[PDB]
Structures are given as structure tokens and as C-alpha cells.
Design a protein around this ligand. Structure first.
Ligand SMILES: COc1cc2c(cc1Cc1cccc(Cl)c1F)c(=O)c(C(=O)O)cn2[C@H](CO)C(C)C
Ligand SMILES: COc1cc2c(cc1Cc1cccc(Cl)c1F)c(=O)c(C(=O)O)cn2[C@H](CO)C(C)C
Ligand SMILES: [Mg+2]
Ligand SMILES: [Mg+2]
Ligand SMILES: [Mg+2]
Ligand SMILES: [Mg+2]
Ligand SMILES: [Mg+2]
Ligand SMILES: [Mg+2]
Ligand SMILES: [N+]
Ligand SMILES: [N+]
Ligand SMILES: [Zn+2]
Ligand SMILES: [Zn+2]
Lengths: 163, 365, 365, 163
DNA sequence: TACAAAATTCCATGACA
DNA sequence: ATTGTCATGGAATTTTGTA
DNA sequence: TACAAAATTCCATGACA
DNA sequence: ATTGTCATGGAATTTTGTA
């Protein structure tokens, strides 16, 4: 019906356990459905509690209409449910084991993994400090389709750090 | 010498004839409308003035009135003014009676991330062991990030800005000259990212106005949320941030969030006008909204303003003036007039200082 | 109820026909120039407003703009304004945007000793173990006595005034409400001498302006005398006192000393005009000079001033407002309007308070 | 030549030793020649030093053109001389033993003595505190000639405490 | 019966924390 | 019941000395 | 083609210590 | 080399719904 827009869906996932960096062990992955903008958040555990702390951070900037995720114990929890109900966010879960998401999102959700590994070899202890540089990198990569960066789709401007 | 021929009735440029210039007690006297006055010799005159003035260090008229009691001579005020221009003490102590020219209204930054203005608020009442808030206002949109710190310190500032500059890196960060930002560690952090640092003139918050005005909104909204309750600001910060970024400016007719994103997130009362347009059509309407924002013009000058001229004797306000000490530095000269409100002076002595005119008085006489 | 017949096309006072009022999702909708808006039922409306407003506690236009995104109904701003008038938090937190009316210029006291204004300066740097100066300005003449004290305290004040009131006793002593003078010991001392005490409104130095303006002259002259040297004010006080009492006001064309004595003492540059007149002829020329002094009139009101009306909701500025707390007291009502700038209010709660309008804002809405 | 005016002459003298009051022993007496205005100052000794401290006080208000006094050791001193020379005050001494002053001044300089004694009997320990009340009293007494108070002659107004 | 320049009066500006 | 004030130095105006 | 009242825009005031 | 800003609520103005 209505065309796809930023903040319509936030695809979230956990990555890790990684080697300990500054006493952190996981990355929470938050990609915007429409733009492919990515936010990364370092956590100590793939728990509801950690998710909520992280997403509280993100949702001072913007609140998605829908968060999509797999049926991970942390997301299917009733605390997390009440958390989203408070903010008027609708929760959407992939069926277990056949975890679909948008074609563009997979493309993206895949890059990150590749990028993190290229980083994790040779520098496995220091990955906490490089998260911002990683983020700036993903958000300013040209999409092979559209040929706009996520940065460009979100802000409608060129970025000051281009790749 | 120049007083002999006057008694002899001869004309001397400046002494009006028609008044009789007699002699008593070996002092030359004249009979004037105002009374009988002593005319002292030229050599005695500067001394006389200095003495009148030194009774209370009085200005032009107040000094003249004293002198006029006993003495007359031609062009009295001329010699008075000459003396006042040379009184170190008055020059550095007296206030201005001349206001600075109209303020400027710098062009709004063109794109978001062109310019961040930053500043610290506090100390506040201890909340969760945090005392200060770092405030970051995007220049173009007014969008604002808040970060709680334990100290208004470089290390804290870096930590917070590392988080922030994941979203995007700004061209320019503008700040005041507080220790946090004038530190070499900060300069280095910025140079690592190709972020240009730019500093307000010392002791002049108008220059950081875009942030400072936002501190007021923050402090006012927090206050309201805290009526009745104990001052527990830490947990409120995010709520204030969201709240504020999503508040309309009655003049712009937009929220910061809008100007940054061109569409509302999933918040209360989210605007739905563009719901029918593709993101592309949205993004260019936004491109156009941003350019056509209201922009103030500078106000008219007050009847008694002053502007800096290159080469003008000028004085700079004392920083943290002690009790009973002068409120002004000794005079210094204008080197370049950067704009009509910012100036480069050669000071004490002699360093180049880039200062605001609000922190200058034009040395008088 | 009042929404059924509207879909049925019937007229309801306030809802313009020509716009079609259809139905979707079980909500009454209307198609407006600005877009498609939901009309909520009357009972739902106050709730809706409160919610919009509570996001950031925004004023009239900023709240309206939020609401206008989703909803329409008639006379929206009316319901908004109604709500803002009832928001405890905003009422006590928001600033004024209305300045108080023009100041008054109280008639100059008629005779010397009709009125003394008094005040303490300091703390100053320890000089001879003294920290404060008691300043006494005669209202009529401007003549000023200085006394150094160890504390801004009743006992000190009495000691000094006992010395002073040997010359003469004043009708009225005017002071601020600092502990020194609001003490019952002071009231008693004054009542012993038939001296009426009179107090400025709390937290308002304009009312003591005749003294406060003189503190500035004192502090400025002392400063100048102390350039270079260590701050040793104690020995200077007398010199400053003499200096100042003997300084011309360029507007009056007289020195305090003159207006008190009608003839100069044996000081530098002592005026000699009356040297030929008997003391009697002198004393009556003085009588006449005093009456014919310049007297300022009150300035014009700024375009957006306000005046106190008896029975007007009004709010008083919080004394020593804590960090993060409201800058204003809850509302209180005007009881008597003493003059257009001083008012009696029933406050918190409920005491009679005599306050200045500079320390009041008219509660809005 | 020119008519008599306030501040033309200040007649000064010492009174005491009196009974100790607040550890004070003498009164310095300062009457204005023209008006009969009187200032009293309590001192610990009839010394130059005490005179100077007292007269420094008086001469923040007004400086006389001439101070007249007897040849008391305290006034004929060279310190006191330099003190007056500093302020441009001319010193004038009565011949020793035949100590003349103005007729009006004697009238006055006599009242004080009478007044102080009336006070000193019955209350000899407390005379320090009553000096102001005494002063106000002398300065607001009607002169039998002129029929103006000294207060009136100095300020050209009625006083708020009349006697 | 009129001029330039001196003398005077006007008056916004700022500081009494 | 209580209330702004006034030194300062350019600029605006008025007066002065001379014709 | 002209009205009262609502809707909107104007804009001085004040606060970021 | 650097530079005031903008929410707020009466009041002033413009637009609206109806003739
Ligand atoms: C504006 O802040 C001030 C508060 C002042 C004072 C002065 C100022 C600045 C100011 C000073 C003098 C005159 C004017 Cl006309 C003027 F505007 C005092 O001078 C004073 C006293 O005890 O004498 C007490 N206060 C207290 C707060 O401590 C309250 C009365 C607010
Ligand atoms: C006027 O006295 C102030 C001095 C201020 C600040 C504010 C004000 C009041 C004011 C505040 C904000 C904006 C505007 Cl325009 C404004 F007028 C700061 O906010 C601030 C900072 O470090 O952020 C540092 N200072 C320091 C002195 O400690 C110096 C810069 C004078
Ligand atoms: Mg998972
Ligand atoms: Mg700062
Ligand atoms: Mg600040
Ligand atoms: Mg006081
Ligand atoms: Mg004071
Ligand atoms: Mg003797
Ligand atoms: N600019
Ligand atoms: N009055
Ligand atoms: Zn000086
Ligand atoms: Zn509110």
C-alpha cells in the first residue's frame, strides 16, 4: 500500500560469543529495514536485560514501528514484550529455524559478519574500540542497488566520511 | 613671559579683551561674569589640573567645576581632557558608556553534521554518581545528543563523542574555551578524524548560543519533570533528549528530528503528511524545506554604539577581577577587524588575542 | 452522541459544512485542506491535549502543532490554552515574557536628615582586621558617612550610628532587609530615638538605589587609589569619604557638602562665590537651591509591560532557588496595589507580603 | 572685611581627667567659631596622638581654615604642627595664661562644663554613652542672641530633635 | 545680525552582587 | 506598609566674542 | 463583496552562569 | 582565527466560512 520508509522495521540480532574486548562479549545488531542503516551495540550477554539497555539507547534517537527478530530466548521474553508495549513498538518474530528477513537486510546482515571477522583475526582483543569505525563503514558503503549509502537514505545528504 | 603684555592691555590669541586683567598678590586676575578668577601661567596649568582631578579622579565636567572655582584660562576643558587621557588609574577603572554594535546572526549551517556546538552543564546534584551533562547540538537541525559525565573533562568528552560519531562525523565542532576542549588531547582526537575544532572568543557565551539556548530548554524540561520528586536526572536524560528532538519550533514549524530525518519515528502524534510519497520524493522535499528555513536579520544599532577600527586604542575586560581591583586591562591596539564584532588585539604583552567586542571598551580621549 | 448526526449531514454549531465527515475504523474523520484528520469525541479531547502537552510541556503553538498531526475539532487552541492554565509544572517553571511597568522616581527628600539610606559593602579583603563598610547616605544631600566593621551585624551598625547621630537625628532610616536591620534589637534602638525604620521590598536593591549607587562610587574610588599597592582600605576610608562628599554632580552642579552646609570647608579648590554674603543671606540662597534641584521623570513604558490589578493572579520569584528546581512560587493573589510598582500579595500560605513587581510575573491563562 | 562663616575657626580644648568611662579619661572639645556647633571626642590622654586620631575623624566631614587653642603641650607639639600643615589648616594660639577666645565660644565652652558636671554627679562611670545625647543637646540649645540653634546655623534647617 | 568655535547641556550606558 | 540612581564622555545644542 | 471570529504570525522578554 | 538563540503568550494581522 504505502511505500517503505525509515523507522518502519528494525531487524535486530545477536553476534557472539566473541573474544573478550574491554570485558564485552556480544554485539547487538540493529539494521533499519528500509535504509540498511546499522547500529551496533556491545553487550556482556545475549540477555533481555542487555537488549533493553542497548535499545533504550537507540530509542532516544528514533523509535521503530516494528522490531523483527528470531525466537531467541532474549526476544521472546515477557519483560522484553512489556518493554515494547510501553513504547508502542510491535514485535515480529520469524518462525523458528526458517528465519527470513528482507533481501537487502540479509545482504547487509552478512557484510557485518564478514567485516567483523576480517577485523577479529589479528586484533581479537581490541574489537570494542573499532565498532564506530566499522559502523561508519557499513553505513557509508554503496548499495549495488539504489546506489545510495544507508547514510544518504537516512539523512538525505552526502556524508563527510565517504568510502 | 606671555602674561606681562596682557596687563599692558595687548592682545593675546585666546584671551578676550573687554574683560580687565588686573593684578593682586602677584597673581594675574580677571573679572568674569561668573566672578573674579586667577589666571595661572601656562607652566603651572597642567599641575593645577592633575590636582583637581586627583581629589576623586573625576571626569571632565566634575573636574572642570572644581578648577573653575579658583582659576580661569582659555580652553580649560582641552587641558582637562588631555589629562584624563593620561590617567592610568581612570582608564583601567572607569566603565564604558558606549555599547557594542548590533550582534550578527551567523548563517545557519547548511547540511546536518556541518557543525556541532558542544558544552557542559553543571555541576548538578549527584544522580547515580554523575554530575555533568555533555550537550551536543547539531547546528543545522537543532538535533541534540545528551551524555551524562562525572567531570567536565576531555576524557569524558572523548568517550561520549566516540559513541556519537558512529552515526556520522561532523565537519566542524564548535565549543567554548573550557579546559575540556582547549586540551591538546582533544585537538589530537579531532585531527585523527578530520574534524576541525573552532573556538568561541574567550568569556563570551553568545558565540555558543545555539548550544547554550538548548541548555536552557534541557534544564527547564528536567526541572518540570522533577517537581515534587527527588532530583534524579540520570534516568530522565534519554526521555528529555527524545522529548526535545521531537518538539516543534513555532517559527520553523518543524522538530529537530524532522529536519534531520524528513520523517517522524514511531512517537506520539507522529506527522503523517508524507505517508504517500516514496522515500525519494520525501528526501527532496526535505532538501528544499531545509534551504527555505526562516533566518533572522541583525537588529538595528543602539544610538550610542561603537565599531572597531584597525589601529584603535582598545581595552579588554579583566577575566576574574579580584575584589577592589580594576575591571579593565591596560590599553592595547586593534590589529585586524575580523568581522564587526570580533577583533584581533595586541595585548599584555604582546600576544595576539582574538576577542569579542562585548569584552572590549574603546579607550576614551 | 453529538457525532451521529454529523455523519448524517446535519449542522452542528462549530463544524463547517462543505467538508465531508465520513467514517473509517470506527473513528469520525474529516477531509481538510491540511489533510485527513480524526475528530475525537468531546469526552476524549481534554485527555488528548494533556498528552500532547505532556511530551515536553510545550506552550500553545508547539502543543497545537503536535495535536494537529492526527486530530481536528473546533476551537482547538481554546482547549489547549485551558489546559496550559492548569499545568502546575509549567506555571511555576516557565519564564515571563512581560516586563514590569516603568520605574518610579520617588521625590527627593526635602530637608537633610529627613531620610538616611544605609547598607553594608563586603566582605572585602582583610584590612586591619575589618571586613565590611557601613555606608550611610543622606537622602536629600547625598552626603555620605563611612564606617568600617568586622561584620554586617546589628551591634556594629548601632555602634556606628551612635557616633553618627550625634550630629543630628534623622526622621527616617531606610534599609534593605538584611539581618543587620531586620533585627528586633535595631527596631528597639530606633524606637528609643523616634527614628522610623522603613524597609525596601525583599530582594530588590533598586529601592535602596540612593545608597547602592553610592557604594559603586566608593568601590570605584577606593579601587583607583589602590592600583599597584596592597589592598589596605582601612586608612583610606576617611579620604574617600571627604573626597566623595566634596565631588560635584555634573547635573546638580553642587557637592553633597554644599547641599548640606551651603559653604565649602577648607578643602582644595573651595568655592568662594558666597564670600560676600552674611551667613543669613547664604542660608536662604541655600534654602532655595535645595528646592530647585533637578528631578528626573519616570521613563516611558516598554511596549509589553504589565500593571498589577487588585485581585490578579500573580506569582513571586523563588528566593534562593535550588539547582534544577522551579524559579517561581505557586500562584497568589494581589490584595492592595500600593503604587504601580509595589504590591501586597496573599502568598504561601497565607501571609501578607509586600513585594516589588520586578519580583512578580502575572500568571498567564 | 568678609562676614564670619562656619569652618573659619575651630576652637579646641581638653577636659579631664574624668572618672574612667569605658576606659576613657578626657573629652576633646571642638566648637565652631561662627555657629557654636560642638563636637565632643573621648580620648585616653591629652596627647598629640589622641588629638590627631580625634581630629582625623572630624576632618572627614569638614576642615577648618583655622584651629585656635591654648598652649597646651599637646597642641604646641611639632607633630601636631606638621599634621595641620598637611591639611592646610592654620594654627593659632592664645598667649599663655591669658587664654582669650570668642565671647560666644566662652558662653558655649562654659555650658558644656556645667552640663558635664550635672551628668557626672550620680552617673560618673557612664559618661561615655551619654556624649551623643549631650552633643545633640548643646547643638540644639537656643542662643540668647541670634535665637538660632547651632544646628540651624550649620544646616539652615530645623532639627528633628528640638530642645 | 550672522558666524565658527567654545561652553554647556543632553543623555544612553553601565554597576552598585 | 512602599518606590532606582547618577558619573561619564561623545554628541546636540546653546552661548560667546567679534563684526 | 464585506463581516466577526478563528487561525496564524508577529515579536519583546528572558535565560542558557 | 570568528560570529547569539529561540520558547512563550498577548497582541496584530490574516484568513475563513458564510452571505
Ligand atoms: C541584582 O543583584 C544584586 C543583589 C543584591 C545587591 C545588589 C545586586 C546588584 C545591584 C546592586 C546594587 C544596586 C542595584 Cl540597583 C543592583 F541591581 C545588593 O547590593 C545587596 C545588599 O545587601 O546591599 C543585596 N543583594 C541581594 C542578593 O544577595 C538581594 C537584595 C537581591
Ligand atoms: C553571562 O554569564 C555567563 C557565563 C558563562 C556561561 C553562561 C553565562 C550566562 C549565559 C549563558 C549561556 C548563554 C548566554 Cl548567551 C549567557 F549570557 C556559560 O554557559 C559557560 C559555559 O562554560 O558553558 C561559561 N560561562 C563563563 C563564566 O563562568 C564565561 C564564558 C563568561
Ligand atoms: Mg539471535
Ligand atoms: Mg562550557
Ligand atoms: Mg553553558
Ligand atoms: Mg545590604
Ligand atoms: Mg549593597
Ligand atoms: Mg588644654
Ligand atoms: N556566516
Ligand atoms: N514620593
Ligand atoms: Zn584619574
Ligand atoms: Zn506543562
Amino acid at each position: 500500500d504505502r511505500p517503505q520508509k525509515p523507522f518502519d522495521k528494525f531487524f535486530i540480532d545477536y553476534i557472539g560469543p566473541l573474544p573478550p574486548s574491554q570485558g564485552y562479549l556480544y554485539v547487538l545488531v540493529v539494521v533499519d529495514g528500509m535504509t540498511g542503516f546499522t547500529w551496533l551495540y556491545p553487550t556482556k550477554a545475549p540477555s533481555t536485560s542487555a537488549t533493553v539497555k542497548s535499545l533504550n539507547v537507540l530509542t532516544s534517537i528514533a523509535i521503530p514501528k516494528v522490531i523483527h527478530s528470531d525466537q531467541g530466548a532474549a526476544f521472546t521474553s515477557s519483560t522484553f514484550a512489556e518493554w515494547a508495549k510501553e513504547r508502542g513498538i510491535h514485535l515480529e518474530f520469524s518462525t523458528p529455524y526458517h528465519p527470513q528477513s528482507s533481501g537487502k537486510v540479509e545482504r547487509k546482515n552478512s557484510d557485518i559478519k564478514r567485516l567483523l571477522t576480517k577485523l577479529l583475526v589479528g586484533r581479537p582483543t581490541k574489537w570494542y574500540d573499532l565498532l564506530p569505525v566499522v559502523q561508519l563503514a557499513l553505513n557509508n558503503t554503496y548499495s549495488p542497488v539504489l546506489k545510495y549509502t544507508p547514510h544518504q537514505l537516512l539523512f538525505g545528504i552526502d556524508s563527510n566520511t565517504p568510502f | 613671559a606671555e602674561l606681562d603684555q596682557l596687563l599692558q592691555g595687548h592682545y593675546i590669541k585666546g584671551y578676550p579683551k573687554q574683560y580687565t586683567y588686573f593684578l593682586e598678590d602677584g597673581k594675574v586676575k580677571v573679572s568674569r561674569p561668573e566672578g573674579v578668577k586667577i589666571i595661572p601661567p601656562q607652566s603651572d596649568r597642567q599641575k593645577i589640573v592633575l590636582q583637581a582631578h586627583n581629589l576623586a579622579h573625576t571626569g571632565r565636567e566634575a573636574t572642570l567645576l572644581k578648577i573653575a572655582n579658583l582659576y580661569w584660562w582659555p580652553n580649560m576643558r582641552k587641558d582637562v581632557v588631555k589629562q584624563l587621557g593620561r590617567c592610568q588609574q581612570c582608564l583601567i577603572t572607569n566603565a564604558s558608556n558606549k555599547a557594542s554594535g548590533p550582534i550578527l546572526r551567523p548563517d545557519r549551517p547548511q547540511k546536518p553534521f556541518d557543525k556541532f556546538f558542544i558544552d557542559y552543564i553543571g555541576p548538578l546534584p549527584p544522580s547515580q554518581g554523575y554530575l555533568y551533562v555533555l550537550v551536543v547540538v547539531d547546528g543545522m537541525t537543532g538535533f541534540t545528543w545528551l551524555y551524562p559525565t562525572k567531570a567536565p573533562s576531555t576524557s569524558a568528552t572523548v568517550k561520549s563523542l566516540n559513541v556519537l560519531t558512529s552515526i556520522a562525523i561532523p565537519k566542524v565542532i564548535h565549543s567554548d574555551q573550557g579546559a575540556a576542549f582547549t586540551s591538546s588531547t582533544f585537538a589530537e582526537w579531532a585531527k585523527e578524524r578530520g574534524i576541525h575544532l573552532e573556538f568561541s572568543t574567550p568569556y563570551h557565551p553568545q558565540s555558543s548560543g545555539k548550544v547554550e539556548r538548548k541548555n536552557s530548554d534541557i534544564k527547564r524540561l528536567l526541572t518540570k519533570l522533577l517537581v515534587g520528586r527527588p532530583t534524579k536526572w540520570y534516568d530522565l536524560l534519554p526521555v528529555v533528549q527524545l522529548a526535545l528532538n521531537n518538539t516543534y519550533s513555532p517559527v520553523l514549524k518543524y522538530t529537530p528530528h524532522q529536519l534531520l530525518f524528513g520523517i517522524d519515528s514511531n512517537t506520539p502524534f507522529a506527522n503523517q503528511d508524507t505517508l504517500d510519497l516514496t522515500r525519494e520524493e520525501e528526501l527532496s522535499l526535505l532538501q528544499e524545506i531545509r534551504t527555505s528555513l526562516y533566518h533572522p536579520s541583525t537588529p538595528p544599532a543602539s544610538s550610542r554604539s561603537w565599531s572597531p577600527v584597525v589601529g584603535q586604542l582598545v581595552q579588554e575586560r579583566v577575566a576574574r577581577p579580584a575584589s577592589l581591583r580594576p575591571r579593565w586591562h591596560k590599553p592595547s591596539t586593534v590589529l585586524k577587524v575580523l568581522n564587526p564584532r570580533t577583533v584581533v588585539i595586541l595585548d599584555h604583552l604582546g600576544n595576539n588575542r582574538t576577542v569579542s567586542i562585548d569584552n572590549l571598551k574603546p579607550t576614551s580621549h
